[PDB]
Amino acid sequence: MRDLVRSGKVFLYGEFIGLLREDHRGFHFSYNPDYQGIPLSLSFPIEQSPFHSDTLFPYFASLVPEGWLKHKYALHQRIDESDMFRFLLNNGENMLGAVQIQEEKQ
Ligand SMILES: [Cl-]
Ligand SMILES: [Cl-]
Ligand SMILES: [Cl-]
Ligand SMILES: [Cl-]
Ligand SMILES: [Cl-]
C-alpha cells in the first residue's frame, strides 16, 4: 500500500469482519463483502455497509475505556477524535471484546 491515512482490520469474536479507516474527510467503517454474520452493533446493519462520518462513529468512540479518557485531565489534553482512533489502533488486540489490528505495512 501507499498512504495516507489510517486503516484498521476489524475482528469480532475471532473473525475478520471489515475495515475502519480515517482520512481528511473522516471515518469509514465497512463490512467485508462475504460477511454475513452477527452485526457489530445495531448502528451497523450489514445491508447498509459502508458507513461514513465526519466524526468517529459513536459505537467505536464508545470502546475507548473511561480510564483513558479520565487520564486527560491531567490536564487538560487534546481528545481530538484522531486521538481516539489512534488509541483504537494502538490497543487494539486486547482492550475492547472486539479487536483491531492496524493494517500495516502502511
Ligand atoms: Cl450466525
Ligand atoms: Cl445474527
Ligand atoms: Cl455518507
Ligand atoms: Cl455531518
Ligand atoms: Cl455508531
Side-chain angles (χ1 to χ4, degrees), residues 9 11 15 25 30 36 42 50 58 61-62 86 94 101-105:
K9 270 163 136 231
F11 293 87
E15 312 297 315
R25 255 179 285 280
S30 64
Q36 202 278 12
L42 43 69
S62 88
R86 209 182 334 289
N94 67 314
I101 197 183
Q102 189 169 175
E103 264 194 333
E104 315 209 68
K105 316 320 196 95

Side-chain angles (χ1 to χ4, degrees), residues 1-10 16 18-32 44 50-57 60 81-82 85-86 88-89 100-106:
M1 283 142 208
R2 303 95 204 298
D3 50 313
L4 297 148
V5 217
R6 297 281 268 175
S7 182
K9 270 163 136 231
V10 166
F16 179 34
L19 297 159
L20 171 72
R21 328 206 105 175
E22 187 196 17
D23 74 10
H24 98 248
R25 255 179 285 280
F27 304 103
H28 314 300
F29 175 57
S30 64
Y31 282 112
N32 285 341
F44 294 138
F51 314 87
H52 297 298
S53 185
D54 58 358
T55 63
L56 180 66
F57 303 107
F60 284 101
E81 286 213 322
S82 300
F85 181 71
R86 209 182 334 289
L88 294 175
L89 287 176
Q100 304 162 224
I101 197 183
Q102 189 169 175
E103 264 194 333
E104 315 209 68
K105 316 320 196 95
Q106 192 196 324

Side-chain angles (χ1 to χ4, degrees), residues 22 27 54-57 60-62 64-88:
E22 187 196 17
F27 304 103
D54 58 358
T55 63
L56 180 66
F57 303 107
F60 284 101
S62 88
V64 177
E66 276 169 15
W68 176 90
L69 301 168
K70 299 202 83 161
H71 178 243
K72 301 204 155 204
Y73 178 38
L75 169 141
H76 29 260
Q77 307 208 343
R78 253 151 281 159
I79 28 176
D80 193 20
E81 286 213 322
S82 300
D83 281 330
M84 283 182 54
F85 181 71
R86 209 182 334 289
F87 171 96
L88 294 175

